[PDB]
From a paper:
To compensate for this innate property of Pf41, surface lysines were chemically methylated during purification, and crystals of methylated Pf41 were observed after eight months. Ultimately, the structure of Pf41 was determined by zinc single-wavelength anomalous dispersion to a resolution of 2.45 Å. One Pf41 molecule was present in the asymmetric unit, and PISA analysis indicated that Pf41 crystallized as a monomer consistent with a previous analysis showing no homo-multimerization capabilities. The refined model of Pf41 begins at Lys21 and extends through Glu369, with a four residue disordered region (Lys59 to Ser62) and an extended, un-modelled region between Ser137 and Ile224 (left). Two of the dimethylated lysines were located at a crystal packing interface (right), underscoring the importance of lysine methylation in obtaining diffraction quality crystals of Pf41. Structural analysis confirms that both Pf41 6-Cys domains (D1 and D2) adopt a β-sandwich fold with expected disulfide connectivity of C1-C2, C3-C6 and C4-C5; the first two disulfides pin together the two sheets of the β-sandwich and the latter disulfide anchors an ancillary loop to the domain core. Intriguingly, despite a rotation of D1 relative to D2, the relative spatial positioning of the two 6-Cys domains of Pf41 is analogous to that of Pf12, with overall dimensions for these two domains of approximately 65 by 40 Å, despite the prediction that the 6-Cys domains of Pf41 are separated by a large spacer. Strikingly, structural analysis revealed that the additional residues in Pf41 map to three distinct regions: a large inserted domain-like region (ID) of 108 residues (Thr117 to Ile225) between the β8 and β9 strands of the D1 core that is largely proteolyzed in the final structure, the D1 β9 strand, and the short inter-domain linker. Analysis of the crystal packing revealed insufficient room in the crystal lattice to accommodate the un-modelled residues leading us to conclude that the region was proteolyzed during the extended time frame in which it took the crystals to form.
Residue numbers in the entry: 19 to 58, 63 to 137, 224 to 369
The structure:
Amino acid sequence: MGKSHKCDFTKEKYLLSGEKEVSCEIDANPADDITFICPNLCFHTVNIAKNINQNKATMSIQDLLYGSVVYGNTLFISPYVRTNTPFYCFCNLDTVTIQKFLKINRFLKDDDELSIISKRGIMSVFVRSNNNVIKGCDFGNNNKNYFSHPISVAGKVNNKVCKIQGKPGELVGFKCAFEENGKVEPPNCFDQVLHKNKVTDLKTLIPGYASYTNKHSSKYPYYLKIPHFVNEQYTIQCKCKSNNAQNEYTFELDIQPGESE
Ligand SMILES: [Cl-]
Ligand SMILES: [Cl-]
Ligand SMILES: [Zn+2]
Ligand SMILES: [Zn+2]
Ligand SMILES: [Zn+2]
């Protein structure tokens, strides 16, 4: 968990601007989240540079910020960032788009909280680095040591079962080997998990928990934020599924009881 940032290019501060480039800029820490609302490629892929002319190159967010998770219009920045990283997302605010959303925004009759020139909107994100590796398992074959238990490091994963221990308040997770049609078991992990060999609603064990997951595949890591109070010890499981038997792994988590302060 961290601060939630937002870049909403549907707002008039962008639409009715005079400039041909309008800017939204974010200074983010690891485990922050960013929501990007564009009225017209990211977060799954992002731009390396702000200038259109040079460094037109783009990169997968997992290659740039390994350990990060994309779900919908939101990015959960990896709990571990190795290097200060800038990246950029662009929004084409053409005159048709602007006219459309100026009409859409008329639905707002007042400024209650929610509980013309063509432009190029730019979201500039700056991500600070940190030192702590992610408490969890990496089942992908690589030497990136972003997680405390990579399969590369001997003794970390035995018999294809990675045993992690989590205390109250801690963030833990795992990352399946990358592929375009891998799945997790149970499908809705962490909201459902394996407990005592049966599928179990995690809310019935550790209510108050939080999770960061992509629900469409096992492309991205799975994260669990253990609540500040855990009444008793629980051992739960999630599993990486794949037609490839080399990518079949078990994430086993020993959740300890307590009250953190
Ligand atoms: Cl998505
Ligand atoms: Cl999702
Ligand atoms: Zn999604
Ligand atoms: Zn009102
Ligand atoms: Zn709390």
